[PDB]
Design a protein around this ligand. Sequence first.
Ligand SMILES: COc1cc2c(cc1NS(=O)(=O)c1ccc(Br)cc1C)n(C)c(=O)n2C
Length: 113
Amino acid sequence: MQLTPFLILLRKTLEQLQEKDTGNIFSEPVPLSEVPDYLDHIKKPMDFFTMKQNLEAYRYLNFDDFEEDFNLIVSNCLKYNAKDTIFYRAAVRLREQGGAVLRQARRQAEKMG
Ligand SMILES: COc1cc2c(cc1NS(=O)(=O)c1ccc(Br)cc1C)n(C)c(=O)n2C
């Protein structure tokens, strides 16, 4: 830990995004055991555990890169699932609530060098 304000802002933001996912639907990768066709449709799977792993290998260099991976969690879920599903509805709610989180977090990242 050589802690930096930007990396700390990303950690905090990631925690706030995960609090919005109250069902833990997006906490871990979509399980290929349960969803065998998932990678026929989804080129770049993403989830909050993969984001946490990326964060702590310093792969997020700016706020936009981090935001892009969050947006993949949502877009993959809307692409794969039918509208009338728990997963689709959850992704729409996460889009709304997560968007509010990232809007706030971006303002901080803008004050930051
Ligand atoms: C949390 O587990 C899952 C998450 C997802 C997911 C599938 C699962 N796991 S799962 O065993 O298929 C499952 C199926 C039905 C219900 Br109801 C709940 C789960 C977790 N898909 C297709 C997604 O897009 N997401 C985000």
